[PDB]
């Protein structure tokens, strides 16, 4: 389907608390979040607006992929425009740049 | 049999009783199906509209007792779009509030909404049981949370 | 008696506690094949817990409660290192 853009270059994830009463002031490491994401889900296909439930240190979070960038192997620079359309899909890699943003609730620190 | 005789109102009464008992008996999906049948039979009749206003609510409640919040939301949307009276009815707002509370997993918010609904429209033992099972399901989710 | 016990390191997966009673006891539930009964074991050289035999936990797995994971910052299915412990020495 994609032809060349088979890998995920940059992925943006909105993070929200599944339960409002479980808000925790704990400092969340984005590197640890990305490491857990790669460790638990490898070689999976993801699309924008796709939802996921993540269990990090016993804490349950709702993750929504707000946008995705698809790149082909051998592209030194990510000149491809970041696409918010659900058409674009990619394969997760151990080098994808994962950017975390606050969820619409804005409770995750 | 009443339906086979085309006695719509008598079949509707029998189905109300059947759905009430089934929902009280743990058969939420079947009760919701019977409520859907009641809604379809009572649609377009000026005589049964409030029954409809309640029907939708009850159906949604059953779908929420079955932990199917998506089905409850679909029912709320269908009732709002199909019945103008239900769209502006307090039952629609209460059902939406319950759906939102279950979505956020806020049992206390659900209790507050129930108290607010009771303050203006008294709840019945059927609704009491349904919402009690729903709150205990939230507690069970809290157990699954560990 | 902690004088004699196998001190070999084991890598064990963190899993949900078997039930509330085990969580209340605050004792690491292990299989008989994992470690002897009623002995102190250290984990990651930092977290010390008392072992209790449990047949519901298969060998090679270690059970933890939510508070222990919070203390250690561990996720479900996380791998941790376990060894015998001797506080007196």
Nearest-Cα distance to chain B for A108, in Å, is 15
| Dist CA B93 CA B132 (whole Å) | 19
Beta-strand pair C10-15/C61-63: parallel
Chain A residues near residue B106 by CB distance under 8 angstroms:
19-21
Give, in degrees to the nearest 5, the angle at Cα A99 between A8 and C73. 110
- What whole-number distance in Å separates Cα of residue A51 and Cα of residue B28? 28
Task: Please state whether C8 falls in left (phi above 0), alpha (psi between -120 and 50) or beta.
Answer: beta
Task: Please name the residues in contact with A17: beta carbons below 8 A apart, sequence gap of 6 or more.
Answer: A23, A61, A62, A103, A105, A107, A108
> Do A71 and A7 form a contact (C-beta atoms < 8 A)?
yes
What residues of A are in contact with residue B108 (Cβ under 8 Å)?
Answer: 21
Find residue B43's DSSP bridge partners: none
How big is chain C, counted in residues? 89
Pairing relationship of beta strands C47-53 and C28-30 according to DSSP bridges: parallel
| DSSP-assigned letters across all residues of C15-57 | E--S-HHHHHHT-EEE-TTTS-SS-EEEETTTEEEEEEE-TTS
Q: What's the rounded Cα separation, in Å, for the pair A58 and C40?
A: 25
Residues counted in chain B: 146
Q: Please, which chains are in contact with B (at least 3 CB pairs closer than 8 A)?
A: A, C
Nearest CA in chain C to A39: C78
The answer to whether A108 and A15 are in contact (CB under 8 A) is yes
Find residue C23's DSSP bridge partners.
Answer: none
Which of A61, A21, A60 is closest to B146 using CA atoms? Answer: A60
Nearest to B113 by CA among B133, B135, B141: B135
C-alpha pair distances (Å), C44 with each of A39, A101, B51, C11, C83: 21, 32, 64, 10, 8
Rounded CA-CA distance A9/C84 in Å is 45
């Amino acid at each position: 389907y994609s032809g060349k853009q088979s890998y995920l270059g940059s992925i943006d994830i909105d993070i929200s608390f599944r339960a409002r009463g479980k808000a925790v002031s704990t400092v969340f490491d984005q590197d640890e979040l990305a490491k857990q994401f790669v460790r638990c889900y490898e070689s999976q296909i993801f699309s924008p607006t796709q939802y996921l439930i993540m269990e990090f240190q016993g804490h349950f979070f709702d993750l929504k992929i707000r946008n995705v960038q698809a790149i082909d192997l051998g592209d030194i620079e990510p000149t491809s425009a970041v696409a918010t359309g659900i058409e674009t899909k990619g394969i997760l890699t151990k080098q994808t740049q994962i950017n975390f943003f606050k969820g619409r609730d804005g409770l995750v620190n | 049999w009443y339906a086979q005789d085309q006695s719509v109102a008598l079949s509707n009464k029998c189905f109300i009783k059947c759905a009430d008992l089934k929902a009280l008996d743990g058969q939420y999906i079947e009760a919701s199906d019977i409520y859907s049948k009641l809604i379809k039979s009572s649609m377009g009749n000026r005589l049964s509209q409030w029954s409809l206003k309640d029907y939708f609510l009850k159906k949604g409640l059953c779908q929420l007792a079955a932990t199917d919040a998506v089905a409850a939301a679909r029912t709320l949307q269908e009732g709002q779009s199909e019945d103008p009276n239900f769209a502006d009815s307090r039952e629609s707002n209460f059902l939406k509030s319950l759906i939102d509370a279950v979505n956020e997993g806020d049992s206390e918010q659900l209790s507050e909404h129930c108290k607010e609904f009771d303050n203006f429209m008294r709840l019945d033992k059927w609704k009491i049981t349904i919402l009690n099972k729903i709150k205990e399901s939230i507690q069970q989710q809290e157990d699954d949370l560990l | 008696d902690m004088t004699n016990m196998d001190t070999r390191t084991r890598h064990l997966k963190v899993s949900n506690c078997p039930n509330n009673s085990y969580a209340l006891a605050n004792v690491a539930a292990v299989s008989p094949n994992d470690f002897p009964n009623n002995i102190y074991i250290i984990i990651d050289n930092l977290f010390v817990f008392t072992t209790r035999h449990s047949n519901d936990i298969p060998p090679g797995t270690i059970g933890f409660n939510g508070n222990q994971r919070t203390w250690g910052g561990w996720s479900l299915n996380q791998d941790v290192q376990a060894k015998a412990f001797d506080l007196f020495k």
